[PDB]
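for the writeup, i need someone to sanity check this before i put it in the appendix. the sequnce is what the collaborator sent (i think, or maybe the updated version? ugh). structure was predicted straight from it, no edits. if anything looks off just tell me and ill rerun, i have time this weekend
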Amino acid sequence: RPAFCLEPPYAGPGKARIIRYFYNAAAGAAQTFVYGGVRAKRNNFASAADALAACAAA
């Protein structure tokens, strides 16, 4: 899987309140986090399905 799938989720310094998904490699699962709208890192998807497709393919 890509290395970014091993990244912790990054809320960043933004004040937005957006539900995003990251691949939690420790858990072997997609998980929700609160993204602030600025400076997203790569492990950051709109849906668990998108996070899983990138990181647990296939």
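The beta strands are 18-24, 29-35. The CA atoms of residues 21 and 50 lie 8 Å apart.
thx in advance!!
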